[model samples]
Target: PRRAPAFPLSDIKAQMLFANNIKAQQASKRSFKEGAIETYEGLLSVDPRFLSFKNELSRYLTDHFPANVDEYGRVYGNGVRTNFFGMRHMNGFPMIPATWPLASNLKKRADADLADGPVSERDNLLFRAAVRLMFSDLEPVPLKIRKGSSTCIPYFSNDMGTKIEIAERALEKAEEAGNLMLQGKFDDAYQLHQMGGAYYVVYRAQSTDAITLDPKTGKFVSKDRMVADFEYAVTGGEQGSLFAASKDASRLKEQYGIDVPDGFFCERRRTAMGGPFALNAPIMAVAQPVRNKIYSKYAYTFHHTTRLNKEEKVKEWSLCVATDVSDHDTFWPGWLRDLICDELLNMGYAPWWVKLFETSLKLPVYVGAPAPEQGHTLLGDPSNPDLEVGLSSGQGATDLMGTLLMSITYLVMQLDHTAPHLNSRIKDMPSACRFLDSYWQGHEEIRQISKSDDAMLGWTKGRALVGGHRLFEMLKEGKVNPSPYMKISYEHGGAFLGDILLYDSRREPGSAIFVGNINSMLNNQFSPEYGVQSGVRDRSKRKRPFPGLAWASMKDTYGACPIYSDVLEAIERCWWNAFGESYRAYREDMLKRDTLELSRYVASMARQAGLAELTPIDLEVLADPNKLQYKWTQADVSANIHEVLMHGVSVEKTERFLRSVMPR
Candidate 1:
């Protein structure tokens, strides 16, 4: 079979990166660089063999590095020297308390730097410059204030006069203490100034921009601008986490040098004026305009990535194509041919079988009479003296002979249809109709054959036709005489062939597919292994008997059994092999003719029908002549007794013969 193509690694990598960044931005406490590193680590933990970034980054920690980092920040500015901030605070040396404000300033500066660059070079140069600034080494700075002793107004106050006084007082004390503890001087006098409890809050933002080039003038306008906003409010008490609120507020003020509103306080009753609260609420928010722009670009990138992955997986699982004969076009004709050839080869059919098959195909038979005389007296001619005086009738005599002849004709038709170029060469519809007419005219042959000395006639005359033919004989036998030639042809040839053909065509492939589908439905009911069965013995009894049989309780009939599956499996296997071989033969012929168009047509047909390519075993069966036998043997006759014991033979010899030879 043809294999689908492989997915691209580049695409997979992009998808992973996009998803990782989105999640990290949503959850991580650190900057984008740190969040990215954490995301990569998580991905690697899930799939250590991840090929996307293994060669690109030896260690995930390296992801935080800029595209281009320099020992000295001379290329951009003195401020671009370190990982985060370039210089120590000029005023507040080692300004740890100032880092948060500076970080925000640095981010805006980087954005402005990119905006300043030429539009053509902005993508590579500006992005690399921004990344470099983000990861550059920065000298750590500690503010003069003690780690937690920073006086700051923490909330919105209703009394503007008092709020201004409180703010001025806190700043004065903060400046006086200068790197020492200002706790007692502030919190003790600020009890009435405490504002409100800390509460959880969330903010969301997005951004967008566009770029275009003017080809005629060899210039470009990189129309890039973004808009963002921030919203803050106390969530309900149930949603608020005082611990998180305190931790986040303290971290901002102490480590990053940002101030929280005085309304926010630590859970431990620490005053906001004495020191920043330890509230843990997250505060950084990207402008909505920026997020929207990134998302739009990422959508395109991810689509390509996912498509490549799907293709690659398909290629990995593809099976190899084997034979030239596997053509799917003209499936019906080719399949029929293949099935006949396979069955014939398996049966060890000889030249005699071929000849018989051809003759039967040319002179096909059909039951032309009404039910009263349908399978009786060969075309319902009862006055024929030969049939009346010679054969004893009891079990299923006439019906059996008719059925056997029909079976032979059916086998021949199957073989004929399967022959190469046979379908196109033969006139089927008209031929079938003509054969039916001739068969009705030849019932006289049955009368003649009845009088012959053929020992087989004795057995053929003792069977009953429980169905159509029973009434046929009762209505017409010994009533109207027909010519001996008519008796021989109709009874011996027409009647027999018609019966066989009808049964084989109706029961084999068509009925089998039907039964298989039904079995699947039953098996799938509830689960794959449980179902109800009719309370009848001889489990072989169909849920609904084929014809006149009535419902009866028997030991064999029970719940779910293996028989359904067995039959389904057999039919599927046979259909697969047979169709596969036919496709091979058809393909081979088309190739020999150097006609790719024809081959493609056939291939399309096969694909539409859901067929697999032909295999070597199927071809072997098609090519074998011995397997084409259509006649029975003495062993076949003996096997009838076993079939009778198991399924209670239909009393019709032809049905008995069918049961004996059919594979269970």
Candidate 2:
């Protein structure tokens, strides 16, 4: 079975010697950590821009760790130092960047790839798709001006003018791309490269609203007409130091042959999308290309430290902050802290940081441990307006119950403002009852009530009865507009619901929520002295029971039950009993914005024009139907009490209340 060699003996021996030489060369190559330090020295250390920064960093390090120093300072390796922050290192670590190829190559590649270029058919599709996806939430509404009105200035405006209609094909084609990427049908690599190129296409296109529309013909028409106005804003107008004393104004005037008016003012685009565009758009775009480069350098250093810290290694790299000197008024301090903290995440050392308090130059030092993952509970301070408790399923029953109680208590406390404000509840409750009655009578969502065991049945029934109370008020006055009640509910819905469903158990174990109270009320002890005990009752074997009929009996015993139809009737009766007219009148008044506008104008004028004392009397004159004798029209103030005051007061009632106050 022996085979002849494929190559000649002399050729084979030469190949083996070449392979050995290559291995020896590889072994002598510098480690990435050492290379990284050299790179930092060549680039940042020698640069004029970084001279002060490097010098300060070196001084801080040497001053704090005097033992870990040499003649040149502790910017990089100090020949004499073996220990840094009480940990030994064979080669000292970099406090700052060098000729690291990864960072340089990363930046160079990203910049080159992300730069603007000719778009291919596929790339164009991606660019178009990105625009649509980002703008999906925006409505294609017109400018906020009345139609047929000829005016240069609109009453109100948005960044987007009339919504532009793009071809439906663009989105459909874009939709097909997600699957290609996900299913790995195409070359899986270079997606970031493709996306980065697309980002530039979108960026250049944003000079006009073309980023939102197409690669062409989406120019902002206002950019031509409002050039001076837009340029004034871009340069910060009078608010900026560069633009102050007409520096920017003169340049703009000479370049565009336009002058900004002294009275000229422009409003920011009134859209959520526009809010961030003014500052973040340009900054984020520029920062993105080099963001990965900065992150990779940090990651390189961290991994280098980790390799040295391994048990098999002789030396440990104790990456430590020598000192923290931060700009008191700028955002850089927080950013630096975040960068350092993020790197410390895996290292098995206490997060030690030193600080210089800017105002007084006070130095405060602290060493802190990471937070425990389990057996920790946070409770909000009762007196603080903002509830601070962080609640999830992990905490014990006591914590859950305590949170539930506080949440429910907060809701009930707001009832005065919320009670009358539950306007939709009037219609919603009846509709809900009707829906539930169909289920309870013959049922769909109702099927569960009949099929479930007694414990579950009681829980569902009780939850509906009390949960309705929570939801009814939770809707509040303005489902159409924002209101405080909905705000509170959004934060506390689960807590409030749990309080009702698991009442006593929320705060205590082995206790029924409201069932215990029902038991107490019924005087039914464990022995059941007054009744014969039903033995071995398999209720499941019996015919499906009617929920309404069962609830009626339960209501008699427990003084509470959720029979949908009966509850609706009870709710209607309750509304009619008292304060119904007040709510009805208030709701009627709410529908007439004109009445409110007139009142607001008159009262404001009165307050400003030396007639503030007569404002109340003026309101009475407007509301009172009995005050017709005064020089006022009844039709204008007709709803002042019937509609305005409760839906109006008479001219006579107004006069009587006002006590012959001035007519104006």
Candidate 3:
């Protein structure tokens, strides 16, 4: 009954063995003594299996991890040196990629397979489904641009003080959401009303009275033609970073009795589908291919270390405003824009990433720089100085429309080898691919959610992923069969009146996702919270509960962040949220690009005219990387932790540590 372990599986198993050996060594040696050098070193000592281990680990790494070092001895895959004042790993990428294949192996093995220790149907499906999804993508949903949604919350831009004062007021309105958390419903506890605080989120596209469309056929365009503009913007022009803000501009104009500009109501697209919105269009065609070599870790690493001057590297400054990306002086988006744009258009990344954002990871898009004083007049400079805006259409619809689409594209490219950003998230691609396939072959609630184009508005990506994660745990632990998952499908309508039926909203918003909040849905048939306290009869069954398997499954599923890091939620809030988060990505991208190359790239553009040529994208040509040398500063590290670092915790002990005692 025993066949030899498979090729990569054999290697995957080797990596797992070494990782486990290292983990077990450290764990067994720990005495809860916070930091002990000797203990850590002992843990680092080479195993007798070290040589064989190295070969096996390389088998996978050679294929995925880029298995090489950069100028700074940094491991490739967007990995970088530790700069912030924090944990050490000098030039270390998180262990995110190392632990995954092992964890993924566990997900596919059945009880019978585990007993005999060979392979099974689950394993085959894991490979087959994953490879299939890897080559393809989920059907792109209809691109729906919002006319009005999440309008202005005046306080952010209207009030003027240092960022401290601005953030204080920002937290004030968030309290309402905070209160919701008390009811097991944590809405977006914090809101980012980043009208225009700094770091130049002022972004993509433009509108001109110069007959942008053909008067007769309505089938034409002109950069001023080929300039990439989105029809799904909240409004139009520069102040266009957010959604519904444009329509809200009219609301504001009517309120104050002042005239707004020609951009707000800017009508770009008539329909969400057609030649303009074609699935194979340039904007839609991200054509992402994992470079099979260079990953974003190198990109992120460069950004982490490069200082933009001949002068010594100073301190760190992250902006995470609305809470998103870089500080004021650091708001240069020109280089950031170019790198991100090229990563999308030039790199080989598969755009299947859209599914995670639109469906399983349903995220909202918001923008910066509608400066309260500026109002909707934020757009209209050079108009087409070869510009672009990733986050907003400025018409309406933040992430759901413009902001979300653009931002997701930028983030997805980070996984590329040449590094625009975020290689860490995808460096561990096996697990990422696993859940991607899972979402592709979604069951019950998950599948239904996948079908709706605007489903994200009804439910949060967090909720959807958590639900899927929970289902995974339930099946793995044998507490629930896949049948329950299949039952929650929507072939038609739900029963409302005796004759009159109804349909439920698929997009779950506020969505209020946190760690482990997936159970208690779909009639609560499988969770520990299965039968409630009663309908009319005051009678309820207390039938056996907690019996261990339920707890185990619960821990298994909802606790982890499905595909990506769970800690990113908190990390992004603190790091990626400031400076309106528009150009924070620019900073990362800036870091990703080679300093020397980007330097001259911007220099040539700037020589033409710097801020003199203002556009939505703050494309300023700054210093060169060759001349700019920076050492990892604790100040820079502390300042930028939110934007770059990965933390220790995840739901489910995604760490899976034995929490019963001596916990991690």
Candidate closest to the true structure, highest TM-score? 3
Cα TM-score of candidate 1: 0.12
Which lDDT tens digits does candidate 1 get at residues 1-664?
1111111213331112112343322321221110001111122111222222221221111223221212211111111111211100011111011100000111222322312222222122222222122112222111111111111213322233433344334323322321121232222222232211111011111001121334587332223221111100011111212221111123335644544332211111110111111110000000111122212332211111111222232122111000011111101121122233244334443322222121111110111111111110111011110111111111111222222222222212222222222223224434432332232222211111110111001001112112113322322343431211111111211111001111122222122110011212211210111011223332222121111110010011111221333333433443344333342243345333322221232323332331134222121112211111111111222232112212211124222322322233
Cand. 2 Cα-lDDT: 0.20
Runs in model 1 lying further than 4 Å from the true structure? 1-400, 420-555, 558-664
Candidate 1 lDDT:
0.20
All-Cα superposition RMSD per candidate: 45.0, 37.3, 31.8
lDDT of 2 by residue, 175-199 (tens): 2322333343222111211100000
Worst 10 residues of 1 by lDDT: 278-287
Q: Rank the candidates by TM-score, best first.
A: 3, 2, 1
* Ten-residue region with minimum lDDT total, candidate 2: 195-204
Off by over 4 Å in 2: 1-176, 181-251, 265-664
lDDT, ranked from best to worst: 3, 2, 1
TM-score of 2: 0.14
